[PDB]
Design a protein around this ligand. Structure first.
Ligand SMILES: Cc1cc2c(nc3c(=O)[nH]c(=O)nc-3n2C[C@H](O)[C@H](O)[C@H](O)COP(=O)(O)OP(=O)(O)OC[C@H]2O[C@@H](n3cnc4c(N)ncnc43)[C@H](O)[C@@H]2O)c(O)c1C
Ligand SMILES: NC(=O)c1ccc[n+]([C@@H]2O[C@H](COP(=O)([O-])OP(=O)(O)OC[C@H]3O[C@@H](n4cnc5c(N)ncnc54)[C@H](OP(=O)(O)O)[C@@H]3O)[C@@H](O)[C@H]2O)c1
Length: 363
């Protein structure tokens, strides 16, 4: 009877599939790519030659028979089936939805693709950055703040402007001390900040592509002349697998309503983990891992007739790398500075934790 299907192999889904496989529980991991994407490092991968090969990890080397590359197009709840484009139906005793989020390319790569194509996409982007003397980053959230710092750190000679629609940078959940220091670090690197300005001609702009002249405009009348436009304008919940089947149980974002055991509302053998769960914390790979531990444990506790584990958030820990040499953040809601973030995140961007989880060695 027992068989756990995991929709999505991001941070959540490979933590779940690793755990299930190590317990020899019957399971199937489904993802549209052939490789796990360490997207935490995607921004460095768009800046450093030869780095992208280190951010994609073949699923089938790690999971073999229990991994299927396919696009989930629906879930049949009365027959307990996951429906794949091309006609495959996977039955389940327990379902884990780990579909994460979608957004503009450099920061997210969600295509039915091979590892070699994915890698080449990032290598193309490095060549775009390298060619461009003038670069605009759109969006001053936690993503675009890292984009701008990565460019200016790897190429100080380049001119980098960041345009953000708010008065302060990065997440509104962060201690004001972290958000002020993000700004100051950006300024000390030489990044041009254009705050409280929304870019207004986005739908006409060539993206991720060097041009001799691109005119960027804002809603306050500012014009910025540039060679390259990179979008860090934010993400959307990827509800493509499940929106039809779970329509009544969705948040307004598209995320799934859960209880503290991460069971989807109305169900006992369906769980949501990571960005697609309607937990009201910022979207973090770290929390994806923690939701994977709870969901896998609760499937086992659910079948073993043991009480279930609960998720109760602690104070926000959140680190911003500011190039490979700098950064700032907070640990359990307390400020931390360059030395800590530099070695914990900035140097490696957690890449080697994904290789370890996957039992592979980086190329
Ligand atoms: C952009 C960015 C993000 C960072 C960064 N840093 C951190 C960090 O330091 N710590 C952290 O915790 N999170 C960090 N994050 C956040 C992190 O990206 C996310 O919260 C993390 O990706 C969430 O993991 P999830 O598993 O929830 O979601 P993913 O999107 O990673 O994976 C979802 C997968 O489902 C897949 N999928 C497969 N088949 C599908 C189907 N048929 N239908 C729909 N989806 C499908 C997608 O293709 C995708 O691979 C960072 O430096 C940058 C620049
Ligand atoms: N753990 C980490 O260090 C880390 C790193 C990166 C991302 N993340 C997480 O991933 C999630 C996404 O973060 P994100 O930075 O990608 O998105 P985000 O937090 O939504 O930030 C993107 C920002 O871009 C702005 N924006 C959108 N369109 C714009 C335009 N035309 N001109 C100017 N500004 C524009 C948005 O403002 P409006 O809404 O006003 O448009 C928003 O403030 C977050 O939950 C984040 O915490 C975490």
């Amino acid at each position: 009877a027992l068989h756990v299907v995991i929709v999505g192999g991001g941070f959540g889904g490979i933590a779940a599939a690793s755990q299930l496989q190590a317990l020899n529980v019957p399971f199937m991991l489904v993802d549209m790519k052939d490789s796990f994407h360490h997207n935490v490092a995607a921004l460095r991968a768009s800046v450093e030659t030869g780095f992208a090969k280190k951010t994609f990890i073949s699923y089938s080397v790690t999971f073999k028979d229990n991994f299927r590359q396919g696009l989930v197009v629906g879930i049949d709840l009365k027959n307990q089936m996951v429906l794949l484009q091309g006609g495959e139906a996977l039955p389940f005793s327990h379902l884990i939805l780990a579909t994460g989020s979608t957004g503009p390319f450099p920061g997210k790569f969600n295509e039915v693709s091979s590892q070699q194509a994915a890698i080449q996409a990032y290598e193309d982007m490095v060549r775009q950055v390298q060619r461009s003397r003038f670069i605009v980053v759109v969006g001053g959230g936690s993503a675009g703040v890292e984009m701008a710092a990565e460019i200016k750190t790897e190429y100080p000679e380049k001119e980098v402007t960041l345009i953000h629609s708010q008065v302060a940078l990065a997440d509104k959940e962060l201690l004001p001390s972290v958000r002020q220091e993000v700004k100051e670090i950006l300024l000390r690197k030489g990044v041009q900040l254009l705050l409280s300005e929304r870019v207004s001609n986005l739908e006409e702009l060539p993206l991720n592509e060097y041009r001799e002249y691109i005119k960027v405009q804002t809603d306050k009348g500012t014009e910025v002349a540039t060679n390259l436009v990179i979008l860090c304008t934010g993400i959307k919940i990827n509800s493509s697998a499940y929106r039809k089947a779970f329509e009544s149980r969705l948040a307004s974002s598209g995320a799934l309503r859960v209880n503290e055991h991460l069971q989807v509302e109305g169900h006992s053998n369906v769980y949501a983990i990571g960005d697609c769960a309607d937990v009201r914390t910022p979207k973090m790979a770290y929390l994806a891992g923690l939701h994977a531990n709870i969901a896998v444990a609760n499937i086992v506790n659910s079948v073993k007739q043991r009480p279930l584990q609960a998720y109760k958030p602690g104070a926000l820990t959140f680190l911003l790398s500011m190039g490979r040499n700098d950064g700032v953040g907070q640990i359990s809601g307390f400020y931390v500075g360059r030395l800590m973030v530099r070695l914990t995140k900035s140097r490696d961007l957690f890449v080697s934790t994904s290789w370890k989880t996957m039992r592979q060695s980086p190329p």
